[PDB]
Structure formats: structure tokens, C-alpha cells
Nucleic acid binder design. Structure first.
Ligand code: MG
Ligand code: MG
Ligand code: MG
Ligand code: MG
Ligand code: MG
Ligand code: MG
Ligand code: MG
Ligand code: MG
Ligand code: MG
Ligand code: MG
Ligand code: MG
Ligand code: MG
Ligand code: MG
Ligand code: MG
Ligand code: MG
Ligand code: MG
Ligand code: MG
Ligand code: MG
Ligand code: MG
Ligand code: MG
Ligand code: MG
Ligand code: MG
Ligand code: MG
Ligand code: MG
Ligand code: MG
Ligand code: MG
Ligand code: MG
Ligand code: MG
Ligand code: MG
Ligand code: MG
Ligand code: MG
Ligand code: MG
Ligand code: MG
Ligand code: MG
Ligand code: MG
Ligand code: MG
Ligand code: MG
Ligand code: MG
Ligand code: MG
Ligand code: MG
Ligand code: MG
Ligand code: MG
Ligand code: MG
Ligand code: ZN
Lengths: 47, 98, 65, 63
RNA sequence: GGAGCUGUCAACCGAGCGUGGAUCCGAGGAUUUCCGAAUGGGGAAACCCAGCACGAGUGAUGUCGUGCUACCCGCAUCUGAAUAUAUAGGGUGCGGGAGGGAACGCGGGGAAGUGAAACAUCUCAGUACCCGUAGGAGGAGAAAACAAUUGUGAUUCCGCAAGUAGUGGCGAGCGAACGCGGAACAGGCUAAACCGCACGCAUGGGUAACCGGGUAGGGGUUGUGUGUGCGGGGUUGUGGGAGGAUAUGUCUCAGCGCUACCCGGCUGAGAGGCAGUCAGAAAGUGUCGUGGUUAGCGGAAGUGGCCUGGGAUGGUCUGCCGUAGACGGUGAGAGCCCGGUACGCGAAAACCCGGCACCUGCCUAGUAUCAAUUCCCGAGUAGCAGCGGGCCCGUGGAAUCCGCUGUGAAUCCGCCGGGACCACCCGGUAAGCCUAAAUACUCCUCGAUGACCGAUAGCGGAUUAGUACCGUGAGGGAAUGGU
RNA sequence: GCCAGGCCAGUCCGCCCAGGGUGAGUCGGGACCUAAGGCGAGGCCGACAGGCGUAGUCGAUGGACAACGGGUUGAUAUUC
């Protein structure tokens, strides 16, 4: 919650949890920035 | 709670007919529309400290008027014409000399 | 007009006389308004409000002040 | 007559009467309501009532 | 809350109020005409006429103000007609009901059009509608259940099972359950036998042989039996209780149970334990909440240059904030001009919820073993028959469930169910009551949203809208936005 | 007053605007009486809804009950 609030109202920036990733948001984004633990959690959830 | 005689009498009636009856020492008032003759007579005697020979009353309906598209009605009124006893002090309306 | 603070000291009979004389003033104001000699027409509302105030004080007195 | 019992409140029932062509029309099943001049204490005043033969057959009320 | 205000169509004025805090917003209280369930009596709703009591007024009638005066039901009391017991009825005093509301629930009554290419069985449909009656939900709910040789274990609702088994002028059609996966879970009181106390009838109207049992007596007459009420006891299906033989007291005190004793038992009090506004008993007084609801307040950052322009929120250079770049307004597309937004504070009082107390209530040994004689386990009930209703089931071989009529049991070696019926086996314990949650709905109040409408659209209704107007009436029912 | 209305026109108007105007012991009604009829305490009947009706109470178009003549206003008069 300390880091989500920081980029919350930046225009063009979209926030979502690793377990809510979806094709529409990925395809609309130009770059996907993962936090390290978020990326590890997403990878672990798929093995 | 307590009743005052001045709640029955509302205003004097100011008109040519009223002014004609002042010369005869007959006074016209607008009274509350649910009073009766005896009540009005008692109230006038108590308020103006004068003898009253008789009281006559009449109801009058309000007029219909249209303003934008539909009629509206004015209030109905009850007038009381009060004639004093032959030899009693005149009532000073304080601004109705006639 | 008259204040409730300055009305809450009159006992019962001064209240009853203030009521009666205020009613008399209202009667006179009504006749003056009818015959066209009243200039400050805001007096009617003031007298009506002080009469209402006197009733309010009396009623609250007789029901658990 | 008087299809309601004054003790147990037993009222009429509703059903169908069925002809040979199996055509069904509404009818009623009335309780067997009979008149009784009942007393409370023995030798007392009699009160008229409308009770069913089941209540009469039991000891519910006495003449 | 903080400088203007005296609502709107809808201005023109007039006259005033306001930092000694107005207008405005919230809460509590006061007043509250007449009609309306309308309820003193009457009545063409919004009107008319009273009676009683207490005050006001008059020389006295006249007059005025404030309370009470409908009917039915329940409870408590006084009276007890014909008429005797008595009852019907009557008087008094306390409580309650009535009427309305958009939907949702439960119980009852119950169409037709239509489909069957006609039509009557059937369908439509237990629908529309009507009647009774609720509650914030309701109903149902604790096995006289399913299952089938293993077993599950109150009810409700959702998904399957399944358009299946079936059922149908076997036509048109209609259509389960077993079981499986889920949401939510919770169980409790009574009747009866038997024991006590009042009221009732007998009987002894004294042989009661009873007065806690006994250890012995006396009063020896009130014992004995039955009914209606109030306490104890008891609540189960591997049957459980009651009553008998082995076994003993939450702790004390007093009283009573006839007298000295054993064993006790009952009542009252105190001492403890537990529970509580609950289905399992009901109210009320306090006090306290980082609790909630009903007003609100603060809240970062551009007077930037030039161009066009009536006007910059546009273009182009620059500066900045951001836990705030939601939305809207302002003279044209505004995070930085305004209301606000993120975020964070805020309650005299009233109401709601929670806690702690007060208070209220319950608990004053029976546990275990044996005996297996006796009593009890919800009656005009179950069952059976007739006629119907409803179940997949349209009467069929028709079980299970419900109604009316007749007939009419048994209390565990009983009774009921397992789809006619019989035998065996299995399951359960009807004819008494209560019970949260999971489910349904929105007249209404707040807060959001829309690949919804944009004035012939969207509500009938952006405009006087259920208005104008039409109809005796029930009813029907418009059009009208933009400097 | 004259732009709508009046089957033409209109200075007029039952049209539009403002103000004024209806005075009762005796007149017509109530506070008096009842008819046909209505409602209807209890009541009887009826599954419910409800039907009918006694006491009673409403209900004139009927019964009972006191005023005539003159004058006056722009508009009331058995009313002043
Ligand atoms: Mg008043
Ligand atoms: Mg006269
Ligand atoms: Mg008159
Ligand atoms: Mg006009
Ligand atoms: Mg009946
Ligand atoms: Mg049919
Ligand atoms: Mg029977
Ligand atoms: Mg206020
Ligand atoms: Mg208020
Ligand atoms: Mg009334
Ligand atoms: Mg009436
Ligand atoms: Mg007698
Ligand atoms: Mg009701
Ligand atoms: Mg048909
Ligand atoms: Mg057909
Ligand atoms: Mg056809
Ligand atoms: Mg309620
Ligand atoms: Mg319930
Ligand atoms: Mg008992
Ligand atoms: Mg008991
Ligand atoms: Mg602010
Ligand atoms: Mg320029
Ligand atoms: Mg803009
Ligand atoms: Mg914006
Ligand atoms: Mg601006
Ligand atoms: Mg059948
Ligand atoms: Mg059958
Ligand atoms: Mg039978
Ligand atoms: Mg079988
Ligand atoms: Mg049983
Ligand atoms: Mg129940
Ligand atoms: Mg429930
Ligand atoms: Mg429209
Ligand atoms: Mg348009
Ligand atoms: Mg009409
Ligand atoms: Mg003209
Ligand atoms: Mg013309
Ligand atoms: Mg009646
Ligand atoms: Mg009738
Ligand atoms: Mg009559
Ligand atoms: Mg009459
Ligand atoms: Mg007549
Ligand atoms: Mg004339
Ligand atoms: Zn019966």
C-alpha cells in the first residue's frame, strides 16, 4: 500500500495484483514493471 | 388557552357603503368566519365599552381569478355590521372619520 | 422583540398581563394596517412572535419547565 | 344447515363431483351439524347450539 | 456555521433584521382548525346539534374556553329477571381492537379466452382475481425419516440427477424421487403414570387405623376413593419412564412434618455456583465505549511570457503539486481559478449496538446395580369402509399425504412405515408446543454506475401532470424545454 | 380596456383588469314532526366475503309555528 499509492494517479499507469493479470491489460500496456516478489509469486503460481 | 375578545374582530371595512353607515353610527367589521351574532355583540361591548343595539352578519364567497392557466380562489369572509344603541358613545376607528 | 431570557422571570400574572397587552397592540396594529396609517409593517410579525413566545413560556412552565 | 360447528369449528370441505364422462364440478362436504339445547350445570337454563355429531357422540356437551 | 438575509413561479416595490452571530443546516420539545378508522349524536367528507364537569361573562337568559361521553372483546368486581338454585342481562373500573401501506409470505376459494387445426377428459392453471391473516421476512423444522444387508442422521435454499423413470382422449401435453456437490448449521420445553396441597362428591358421617416411615405410645376421627386446579417427578427408541430390593446427601440455621430416637423429607432464610434480556423466563436503573447514525470542517500546487480571440480553460514556451490527473462550474478542452477530490479530523442531544454493574432467575444428591410383578408413554385419535382432493401417478393392482360421513382400537408381547397384500427382516416412535442462519422483496433513505434516452425519445408526467379536458360514475387522460 | 372572443365591424359587451356589492326573532330551510325509503346497537342467518332486520336514528315533495304598508342605494331589502 505504500507503493501503490505512490503511482496511483499517474496518468497512463495501471496497477493490478499478480493473481489478477489478464490479456487486455497486458496488451494495452507498453511496458510491464514487476516488483520482484510479485514476479516470483506469479512464477510460483504456475510452476 | 385563555380567550380574548380581540381574536374575533379582525379589521374594519373601508368602503363607500361603510363610510355611509358611519354617518348613521353603524360600523362594519371583518370577523372570524366561525363566530356568531351574540358572541360578536359581547366582544364589541367588552372591547369598545359601548352599548350595542343589534348585530347583522353576512357571508361572502371569494372571487375566482386566473393567473397563468387555471383558476384560483380568494378567501371567503364574514362581515358584521354593528349598530350602536341610540345614545351611546361613538366608536373611534382611529383613521376612519368618514 | 422581547427575549425569552427576559421573559423567564415574570411569574404567571405578569406573563398573563404581557399576553393581554400584546394582544391589544396586535389589534391596534391590525386596525392601523387596515386604515392605511401603518408605516413599519414589520411590527405585525414581531407582535405575533412575542405572543407565541409568551404561550411557549407558559406551556413549558406548566409542563415540567 | 349451519355448516360450522360451535365447539370445534369444523367447517365444510371443498371438492369435485365427478360424472361418468369425468366432468368435474365444484361441490361441498358439509359437517353433520345438529341442534342442541345444552345446559352448563344440571337443571340450568338451556342454550341453543350448532354442534357436529362427533361432538355429540363424545361427551363434549350435555343436554 | 460564519456575512449576509426577509422561499419559488417572478419580478416590481415597501418596510426591516444581522458579528450582542441573522438567514441557513441537524436533533429534541411546544402548538397543531375541520374532515378522515372518525369514535357524543347526526350528516350531502371537510357541516350541523348536544349532555355532563370545571372555569370565564351578563342585571339574568343568551355566549365562550378546556376535559370526558361510540361499539365490540378480555380481566376484576357489585347485582341475579321470568324463578327457586341460579343464569341471561345490567352497573362500575382497568386494558385491547378497528384503519392505511409498492412488493415479498402463509391458509382458503377459484375462471375464461387459449392449446388440443373441432370439442367435453385434458390444457391454460391452481394462473388472473377474491377472502382471512401476518412479519422483517415468512413458512418448514428435531424422524411414527430415508435407505437396503453397507449406511445416513432436524429444517430451508442453490446446482445436478432429468426433460429421465414415468404419466397422458398414451392425444396436445405434463413430469418426480433415490442419491451426489454446496450455502448455513442448534436444539429445546411439555402431557401421562406416581407423589403433595386447595376446591367437589361419597363414605366412616368415627372404626382413620390415620396423625413423615419405622423404633412405643396417645388425640383415637378424620381417614379412605374419586374428579377439577397449583407444585414435584418425568421426556426416551440400543426403548425410556413410574413404582420395588442393594446406595446416600450444593453447606448452615430456623420452622413444620405428633411425642423421646434412627432415617429422613418439606418450607423459609442465609452462603455459594451458573445464566440472562435469549427458542431454551421478564422487565427496568445506571455507567462506560480508539463503537455507529442523524449537521460539518480542513485540505498541495501558475496574478507566468508570446499568438489568436469578445472572453483562454486553445496553440506554443516555461514553473509546480500529486496518498489529490474523480466529477462539475467559471466568457472555448483547467491537477495548480472555484465547489470539491486523496487523506484526515468532528457530536450538546436523541437513537442504535457492545461492555461492566445493579437487578432478575435457576440450582438445597441422587448416582450406580438388581428385581422384571404392576402402571405410563398425547382418543372420538389411529385403523377400516363410502365419496373426493393432491401426489410422475387422469381410479388404476394404487401405496404415502389431506377433507367430510359412518364405524371405531390398542400403550411396548404396543403401534406405524418400507408402492396392492401376506410372512420374515429393517427403520421409527403419530394423534402437544417453540426454535436462529443460509431464502424472497423495495413504497422508502443515502452512495455509486451505465458500448441506457436526450424533449414525437425517456416515466402518462423535464412545462399547472394524474393537471387541463372527457364521462352520471367506475374510469380515461393530454400538449407545452433552448436569447 | 379593446391584437383573443362575439359567425361582419365595434368606441359596445354575459369578453379582459381592478375595486365594490348580498344586513332577517317573523321570508326559504335547521335547531320541531313524521311518509316511501335508507342506515341499523344487540339479534337471526350465512364456509369467509356477507344477507336481513328489532330497538333506534335519519329522510319533504307533506303537518305545526310570529309582519304589513311606505322610503331609500350604482349595486340589498317582508332583511336597512
Ligand atoms: Mg391555541
Ligand atoms: Mg334588525
Ligand atoms: Mg342572514
Ligand atoms: Mg375576470
Ligand atoms: Mg356461524
Ligand atoms: Mg375446466
Ligand atoms: Mg370422523
Ligand atoms: Mg432550525
Ligand atoms: Mg421539530
Ligand atoms: Mg362524529
Ligand atoms: Mg354516524
Ligand atoms: Mg334467583
Ligand atoms: Mg390491520
Ligand atoms: Mg376451456
Ligand atoms: Mg381448440
Ligand atoms: Mg385453431
Ligand atoms: Mg412489527
Ligand atoms: Mg416462524
Ligand atoms: Mg403436573
Ligand atoms: Mg410439571
Ligand atoms: Mg470547505
Ligand atoms: Mg489579440
Ligand atoms: Mg471547460
Ligand atoms: Mg474536469
Ligand atoms: Mg474562473
Ligand atoms: Mg386424484
Ligand atoms: Mg390414489
Ligand atoms: Mg374415523
Ligand atoms: Mg414392499
Ligand atoms: Mg406418542
Ligand atoms: Mg412451528
Ligand atoms: Mg428463518
Ligand atoms: Mg413525453
Ligand atoms: Mg429538437
Ligand atoms: Mg366532470
Ligand atoms: Mg376586438
Ligand atoms: Mg370581430
Ligand atoms: Mg352488528
Ligand atoms: Mg338493514
Ligand atoms: Mg325506519
Ligand atoms: Mg329531520
Ligand atoms: Mg316542504
Ligand atoms: Mg336588483
Ligand atoms: Zn364439533
Amino acid at each position: 500500500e505504500a507503493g501503490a499509492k505512490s503511482v496511483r494517479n499517474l496518468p497512463g499507469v495501471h496497477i493490478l495484483a499478480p493473481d489478477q493479470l489478464n490479456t487486455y491489460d497486458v496488451l494495452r500496456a507498453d511496458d510491464v514493471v514487476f516488483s520482484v516478489e510479485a514476479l516470483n509469486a506469479y512464477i510460483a503460481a504456475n510452476t | 388557552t385563555l380567550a380574548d375578545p380581540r381574536d374575533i374582530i379582525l379589521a374594519p371595512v373601508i368602503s363607500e357603503k361603510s363610510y355611509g353607515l358611519l354617518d348613521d353610527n353603524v360600523y362594519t367589521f371583518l370577523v372570524r368566519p366561525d363566530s356568531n351574532k351574540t358572541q360578536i355583540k359581547i366582544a364589541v361591548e367588552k372591547i369598545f365599552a359601548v352599548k350595542v343595539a343589534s348585530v347583522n352578519t353576512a357571508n361572502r364567497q371569494g372571487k375566482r381569478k386566473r393567473t397563468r392557466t387555471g383558476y384560483g380562489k380568494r378567501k371567503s369572509t364574514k362581515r358584521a355590521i354593528v349598530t350602536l344603541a341610540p345614545g351611546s358613545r361613538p366608536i373611534d376607528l382611529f383613521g376612519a372619520p368618514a | 422583540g422581547v427575549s425569552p431570557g427576559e421573559l423567564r422571570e415574570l411569574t404567571d400574572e405578569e406573563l398573563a398581563e404581557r399576553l393581554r397587552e400584546s394582544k391589544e397592540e396586535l389589534f391596534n396594529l391590525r386596525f392601523q394596517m387596515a386604515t392605511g396609517q401603518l408605516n413599519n409593517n414589520r411590527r405585525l410579525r414581531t407582535v405575533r412572535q412575542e405572543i407565541a413566545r409568551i404561550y411557549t413560556v407558559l406551556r413549558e412552565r406548566e409542563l415540567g419547565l | 344447515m349451519a355448516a360450522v360447528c360451535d365447539i370445534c369449528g369444523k367447517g365444510p370441505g371443498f371438492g369435485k363431483s365427478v360424472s361418468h364422462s369425468h366432468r368435474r364440478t365444484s361441490r361441498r362436504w358439509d359437517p353433520n351439524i345438529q341442534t342442541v339445547h345444552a345446559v352448563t350445570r344440571p337443571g340450568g337454563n338451556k342454550k341453543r347450539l350448532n354442534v357436529c355429531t362427533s361432538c355429540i357422540k363424545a361427551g363434549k356437551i350435555t343436554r
